[PDB]
Curated annotation (Swiss-Prot), chains A, C:
Protein name in UniProt: Ubiquitin
Biological role stated in the UniProt entry: Exists either covalently attached to another protein, or free (unanchored). When covalently bound, it is conjugated to target proteins via an isopeptide bond either as a monomer (monoubiquitin), a polymer linked via different Lys residues of the ubiquitin (polyubiquitin chains) or a linear polymer linked via the initiator Met of the ubiquitin (linear polyubiquitin chains).
Originating organism: Homo sapiens (Human)
Phenotype when changing residue 65 to G: Phosphomimetic mutant that can recruit PRKN to mitochondria
Record-annotated site: Interacts with activating enzyme: 54, 72
All residue ranges annotated as the Ubiquitin-like domain in the record: 1-76
From Swiss-Prot, chains B, D:
Stretch of the intact protein here: 1 to 73 of 128
Localization per record: Cytoplasm; Nucleus
Glycyl lysine isopeptide (Lys-Gly) (interchain with G-Cter in ubiquitin), cross-linked positions: 6, 11, 27, 29, 33, 48, 63
Effect of residue 63 to R: Abolishes HLTF-mediated polyubiquitination of PCNA
Protein name as catalogued: Ubiquitin
Positions marked as site (Interacts with activating enzyme): 54, 72
Annotated site location: Essential for function: 68
Gene (UniProt): UBA52
Effect on the protein upon substituting residue 65 to D: Phosphomimetic mutant that binds and activates PRKN
Modification type Phosphoserine: residues: 65
Outcome following mutation: residue 72 to G: No effect on ADP-ribosylation
Amino acid sequence: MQIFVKTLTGKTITLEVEPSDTIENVKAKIQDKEGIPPDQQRLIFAGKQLEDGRTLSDYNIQKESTLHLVLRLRGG
Amino acid sequence: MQIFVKTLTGKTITLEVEPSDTIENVKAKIQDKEGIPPDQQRLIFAGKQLEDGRTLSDYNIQKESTLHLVLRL
Amino acid sequence: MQIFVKTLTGKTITLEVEPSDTIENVKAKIQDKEGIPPDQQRLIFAGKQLEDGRTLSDYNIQKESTLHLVLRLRGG
Amino acid sequence: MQIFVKTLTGKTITLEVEPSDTIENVKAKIQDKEGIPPDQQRLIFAGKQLEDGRTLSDYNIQKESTLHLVLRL
């Protein structure tokens, strides 16, 4: 399956995933493609901040869906 | 000074605010028009998540700046 | 010419540049490849934080050089 | 509590410090062993630039955390 992850700038990252892939797995793929730590990553879908332990299928994220990458830095 | 906020539905609402207003203060104004409690809200600006304690000016939120309201649960 | 930009994670971004390319031009290429705003980008080379208006040749950045991408968020 | 700092030369030096110490306070200790003034220093940790006002604990700098000292000019 294939989903898209959009960055502030507008860059779109395309990832090959499975409906059962957790958000944790996706953050791992984002660290591979963006060099950003899963702890620093924040994923948004339909205005909801996703939880790492839930799978894409748990959030009804279908083929071609777009997620938004937000940054969460410990203290700044 | 008025700022904008893209809400959960996607509809942009307008908020009145001062350069000096903790994000917590802003979330409270968003609870008035939206119903969602501050601790249950998450504000984003310039691609990052804003802390409840920091002030609107600490992030350099200007004139007609637009924020994104997401649901953290 | 070709230089490398390393991220915290260890990801390496490869960019085609010219010795006369400013740091500003490189940050532009990083926004293209990483979706991160030049204002949020901080470039390091040899332990020195580079200035956007200077060219690579001004910092003796040769072929294959490695720069480190650091983040600078306004207030956090 | 002791923290590490990769200096300009690349040599890692060791600093004694408290969970509560503004970054400014840390830069001062780095000026002692390095010679570079605080305003002329730039500290990085977990890929980001740390602010002079924020405290070492606000960034969750623990046990044997390692920072990078760069020259901002």
